[PDB]
């Protein structure tokens, strides 16, 4: 029974896709079949901005930030709750929440 | 065949133009390609007023020649058409339903709400798709106020108007009620009707 029309991943007009590695476990996962998530974080805590401003120079200069991308396999994404099992009708909703 | 007295009535044409009964939505639906004029810029479809009026008189004639005035149902789920359908049922012997439709009115012959009318007039096929569905189930002709963004399934007579604005809804229901009242009974064509279309409009208030 074909659960998903995509068969679990988006791939059309192609025969092979270069695989990548997971993060929590580092499993072999296809590039499209993986789960891509964005975690844009700051270099300090929300409560550490005041301490940094008191103990910084350069006239309260803008604190930088870190952009990193995470690739999760199916099992790790489900376990880490970044991706969860949905109902049959709700599976088709590809729009992010 | 068709008398020339039933015509554009330029004054009412100007009223429809001011009420924006020709300013439709951005989609076309193909099934109403004939009811639209040349495509205005920024994707606004303008409706042919002549065709709109001709369909309106045809709808009025269909509403006419019904032996029992009390078996003409009116449906309006949207709050915009509540006042229009109430005034339509006040001026004409028809019946009107506003808001909730309670699916199973025409079917389900056991319920108290069962009415079985002979002809159904619908304010908006998209918002009243339940009523059209039951009408197809129970063999009832359908007249509907339809825009370019409206499905015409199981719709026999379509009035190509805005269907969205309160001015467009009120004016069309007033014109339809006036036309059906001029077709028979009283209210001769030469004498203007005492009531005016702004009564059909629904206020907040």
């Amino acid at each position: 029974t074909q659960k998903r029309r995509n068969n679990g991943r988006n791939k059309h007009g192609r025969g092979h896709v270069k695989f990548v590695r997971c993060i929590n476990c580092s499993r072999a996962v296809p590039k499209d079949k993986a789960i891509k998530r964005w975690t844009i974080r700051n270099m300090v805590e929300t409560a550490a901005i005041r301490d940094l401003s008191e103990a910084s120079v350069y006239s309260e200069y803008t604190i930088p930030k870190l952009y990193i991308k995470l690739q999760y396999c199916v099992s790790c994404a489900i376990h880490s709750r970044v991706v969860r099992v949905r109902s049959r009708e709700g599976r088709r909703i590809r729009t992010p929440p | 065949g068709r008398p020339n007295i039933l015509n554009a009535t330029d004054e009412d044409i100007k009223q429809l133009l001011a009420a924006n009964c020709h300013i439709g939505s951005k989609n076309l639906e193909v099934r109403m390609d004939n009811y639209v004029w040349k495509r205005r810029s920024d994707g606004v479809h303008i409706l042919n007023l002549g065709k709109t009026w001709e369909k309106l008189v045809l709808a009025a004639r269909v509403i006419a020649t019904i032996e029992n005035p009390a078996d003409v149902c009116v449906v309006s789920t949207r709050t915009y058409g509540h006042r229009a359908v109430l005034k339509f049922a006040a001026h004409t012997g028809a019946t009107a339903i506003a808001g909730r439709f309670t699916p199973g009115n025409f079917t389900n012959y056991i319920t108290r709400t069962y009415r079985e009318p002979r002809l159904i007039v619908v304010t908006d096929p998209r918002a009243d798709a339940q009523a059209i569905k039951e009408a197809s189930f129970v063999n009832i002709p359908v007249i509907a106020l339809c825009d370019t963004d409206s499905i015409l399934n199981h719709v026999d007579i379509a009035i190509p108007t805005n269907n969205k604005g309160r001015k467009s809804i009120g004016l069309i229901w007033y014109l339809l009620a006036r036309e059906v009242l001029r077709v028979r009974g009283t209210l001769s064509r030469s004498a203007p009707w005492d009531v005016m279309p702004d009564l059909y409009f629904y206020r907040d208030p």
Binding site: - | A8, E11, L17, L49, G50, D198
Partner: protein
């Protein structure tokens, strides 16, 4: 949890729609009229009905409620529904914002002289 039951809701709805004009907001008076009109079995149920009824009275006094209607509200509806202003869609000098509608009016032969353009 002090959620009322359907019996209290219906009983409160019927008394307010039956005796709205002569009802008094005072708890003692509305309990009196509830006792004199209803055939309530127990005083506890009567008190709960009266409490819900007077809460509905304060709610209506604060703002109109669509869940309950009576003769006064029906008369208000039948009076406000006849309001009519002057004509609005055949006034304001002329129609405005009509670029291609003028062309369609000229083509149809029902062209109206008053037209602006954009």
């Amino acid at each position: 949890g002090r959620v009322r039951t359907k019996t209290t809701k219906r009983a409160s709805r019927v008394v307010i729609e039956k005796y709205y004009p002569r009802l008094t907001l005072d708890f003692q008076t509305n309990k009196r009229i509830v006792d004199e009109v209803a055939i309530i079995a127990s005083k506890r149920l009567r008190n709960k009905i009266a409490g819900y009824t007077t809460h509905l009275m304060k709610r209506i006094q604060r703002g109109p409620v669509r869940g309950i209607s009576f003769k006064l509200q029906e008369e208000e509806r039948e009076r406000k529904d006849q309001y009519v202003p002057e004509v609005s869609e055949l006034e304001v000098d002329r129609v405005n914002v009509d670029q291609d509608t003028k062309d369609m009016l000229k083509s149809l032969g029902y062209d109206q002289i008053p037209v602006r353009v954009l």
